[PDB]
Design a protein around this ligand. Structure first.
Ligand SMILES: Nc1ncnc2c1ncn2[C@@H]1O[C@H](COP(=O)(O)OP(=O)(O)C[As](=O)(O)O)[C@@H](O)[C@H]1O
Ligand SMILES: Nc1ncnc2c1ncn2[C@@H]1O[C@H](COP(=O)(O)OP(=O)(O)C[As](=O)(O)O)[C@@H](O)[C@H]1O
Ligand SMILES: [Mg+2]
Lengths: 494, 494
């Protein structure tokens, strides 16, 4: 009867809803976009409500627009943006401040303090993280101390805190459930990760009442029922990345994928052990083959697809993301030009909040095409940057990188990437790899599936990009690239 | 009978022809553009022929489109781009290599050698120059050594060398005259400036045959006749700048002007005595009130209006030089962006053949308008850069700056300029200040005029810019600027 499953995707710039068949075919897609709030420079916010509305809209049209009824889909899977924080009035069921995006940089001050007070190591050690406005730890704080009663209510279990997922479930289940998963948990910077639980150190250090925290659960488990009707399950939950990692079926030690979207995230699975990055990465929680904790090596890159948007929206050198390849190919080379996409500081191995974007190597004969290209190239540089650490830590030579993400369509890109990595690059047949995950996770969590090895057929690499550039050629390039970076670091006067 | 005088101006990006009456009015102007060759990044050449050619026509036009006849003009004045080197077959009358433009950085290697043979002082001392690809000595060489028999023929007077002027005159006078004036001579880096003659040291050091050199003469004298006819005369030569200094009538100690065009040349008259820079400036030859030798302190800025061209032709952020003002005033500020126009290295006071162009402090809210603005701004910075050296060296506080050049039409610029300086800026009434120059010289040379007080009434300042920014603001900006610069130097790998 119940022939399908639903993947709910709460993205950085929109909400999506996806439907699959048993053969995991994409039956249908829905998707509204929602407003980006830059209260001020470096600041990003969302309307927890807007976020919500969308996502629901999504949910339904899917439904209708394909003419499926609540009576035919197993469960629901769920994926979302990862650091972005929410806090709301419970009773009221209203947010007491707009969602603060992972993107947002307001929590810098704080970050600085912490730094002082010799905590890096507790953090790195117990959170697998690092000090940076990225993670919600400080986000949360920022709110607390910015709102009045706040800490009281909070303390008196009055105020609720969530992560996209968290916040979603709440609504699904009308206030009934206040849970989250591990992956997602991880991300907060208030969660011991070999302990699988909140961490008082932080909790108090950050000064947060355990009262508003939510039940941290497994990624592939049943969390509740949604009477979207005809009560529907919620059995899936991951960070879009882990999500996608899962969907790429990197579901066991040394498997990795690089994702090319608004940003860049390359996760590598560390199986059951959590490995410590000595080279500027993140230690984080993933999914093992059942929705079960696993560990992962993570490189996060703030600007990727976004620079492209920049290009199109603020410089207006292009009209389409699409356009970029045509122009890039319009020239033979970057003409010596280098573009450092540190619009938001650096991160990745760098983690330099004072970096600022920069263009280098200008010469009279350089033109917009050259600038465009350079831009794309930067994306690859970045990706190599981390690849290298990954290997550093990992102690593993990937011979093939499996990618995914919106921009994995830019073939130029794709091939440039292979060329500079000196590695083979695999472009999967399907692309909604993320949803994939949450949908798996979900129905795996419902015995809609009794294995990975069923959906293992969805994993069909469509395109293999082999390197075609000379090793020299290769390092040549990379050199200047770093030359650049150095020059862009520490711009911001602190 | 003969009522007019013609100025011939061979510039970095275009040839020009200008006509004037006795009251020194601009009867008419002709003007054809010529291609800029960037054989390779940091390299710039011209087609001596295309020079020629385009310089040839303007003449005509100007004539013919005002219906003047060869019979009504006295002489002909000559101003040209100052360092650009040409070498050509004589019998044959053809270049044996494209013009190497002053901008061109190909001769840095060489330059490096010279540096390590401890010749800076001799240079500095006898030339008033500095070791840098700017000046021709090395250009010449570069050619020699890059062409086959070259030094023989050269050696057997087979080959001929000259600067633009030298090259024009040659053409003018079908092969009749091979001279140049001092100004222009100075610039070669092969002429002692206290001896007023070639200098063997140099000559041999660089291994140039005294054979292809040209008679060095006075700026205002009768060199020959042009049968453009109806034999017309040539009684005037000057490097463009020198020429505009005269036109500005800065004709005695402490008179300075800053010119704004393809580049930025700020000169200041040092009378009969040659002052020695200690602050990265140039000691060179100028015109005394009678077209007699004088000395000057010179600051050379490679990129200026040129970065605007860039914006418009390569980046295409605008359709008109014009447009720049509008867009810039479209924003309140450069939003932290800093642009370092080092497309052809740095130059005064820096003299960094390895610096390359750079954009800085990018941030996602940055737009094309900010870029635009930044660029202009960078022009004023640079200017400040030198102005202080100027004083550093001069030991003189200018209380006003007299400018001129294409770009002084840019009021925003102009204003911004006076703000960052902390000084009033004077925009004279007449703008063909250069042609003015050449004409005078040329005509002054022929009893077409018999005193610089005559023409003296043209110096009417039309607009005066006074600073509207606070002293702080001022240094605050400058600071970033310098910060910016630092980061752009030594890009190029040597
Ligand atoms: N073709 C091409 N080329 C290049 N580039 C490109 C393209 N397309 C697109 N692109 C890009 O991509 C991106 C998008 O894609 P994606 O969705 O996948 O990502 P995400 O992260 O998910 C965001 As959400 O989370 O906020 O939604 C963006 O950023 C753009 O820009
Ligand atoms: N408005 C405005 N704004 C800005 N800018 C401008 C304008 N107009 C113009 N401009 C500019 O300026 C310049 C012109 O002016 P001049 O003619 O004087 O220059 P030379 O010296 O001649 C070089 As050639 O000799 O090579 O031509 C050029 O470069 C442009 O860009
Ligand atoms: Mg000129």
């Amino acid at each position: 009867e119940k022939k399908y499953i639903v993947a709910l995707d709460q993205g950085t710039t929109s909400s999506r809803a996806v439907v699959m068949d048993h053969d995991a075919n994409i039956i249908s897609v829905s998707q509204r976009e929602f407003e980006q709030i830059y209260p001020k420079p470096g600041w990003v916010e969302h309307d927890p409500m807007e976020i919500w509305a969308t996502q629901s809209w999504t949910l339904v049209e899917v439904l209708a627009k394909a003419d499926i009824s609540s009576d035919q889909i197993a469960a629901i899977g769920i994926t979302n943006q990862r650091e972005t924080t929410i806090v709301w009035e419970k009773e009221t069921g209203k947010p007491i401040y707009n969602a603060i995006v992972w993107q947002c940089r307001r929590t810098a001050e704080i970050c600085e303090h912490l730094k002082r007070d010799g905590l890096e190591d507790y953090i790195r050690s117990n959170t697998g993280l690092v000090i940076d406005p990225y993670f919600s730890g400080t986000k949360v704080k920022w709110i607390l101390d910015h709102v009045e009663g706040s800490r009281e209510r909070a303390r008196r279990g009055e105020l609720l805190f969530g992560t996209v997922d968290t916040w979603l479930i709440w609504k699904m289940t009308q206030g009934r459930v206040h849970v989250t998963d591990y992956t997602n948990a991880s991300r907060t910077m208030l969660f011991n990760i070999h302990t699988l639980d909140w961490d008082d150190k932080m909790l108090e250090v950050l000064d947060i009442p355990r009262e508003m925290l939510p039940e941290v659960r497994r990624s592939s488990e049943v969390y509740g029922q949604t009477n979207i009707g005809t009560r529907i399950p919620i059995s899936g939950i991951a960070g879009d990345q882990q999500a996608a990692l899962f969907g790429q079926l990197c579901v066991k030690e040394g498997m990795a994928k690089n994702t090319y979207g608004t940003g860049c995230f390359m996760l590598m699975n560390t199986g059951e052990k959590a490995v410590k990055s000595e080279n500027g990465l993140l230690t984080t929680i993933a999914c093992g083959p059942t929705g079960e904790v696993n560990y992962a090596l993570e490189g996060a890159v703030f600007m990727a697809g976004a620079s492209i948007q920049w290009l199109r929206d603020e410089m207006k050198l292009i009209n389409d993301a699409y356009d970029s390849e045509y122009f890039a190919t319009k020239v033979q080379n970057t003409n010596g030009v280098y573009v450092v996409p540190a619009f938001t500081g650096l991160g990745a191995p760098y983690w330099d909040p004072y970096a600022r974007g920069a263009i280098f190597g200008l010469t009279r004969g350089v033109n917009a095409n050259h600038i465009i290209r350079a831009t794309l190239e930067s994306i690859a540089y970045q990706t190599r940057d981390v690849l290298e650490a990954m290997q550093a830590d990992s102690g593993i030579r990937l011979h093939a990188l499996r990618v995914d993400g919106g921009a994995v369509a830019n073939n130029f890109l794709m091939q440039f990437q292979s060329d500079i990595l000196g590695t083979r690059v695999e472009r999967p047949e399907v692309r909604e790899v993320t949803a994939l995950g949450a949908a798996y996770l979900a129905g795996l969590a419902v015995g809609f599936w009794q294995n990975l090895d069923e959906l293992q057929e969805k994993a069909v690499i469509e395109r293999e990009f082999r390197p075609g550039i000379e090793t020299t050629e290769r390092n040549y390039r990379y050199a200047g690239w770093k030359k650049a970076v150095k020059r862009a670091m520490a711009w911001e006067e602190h």
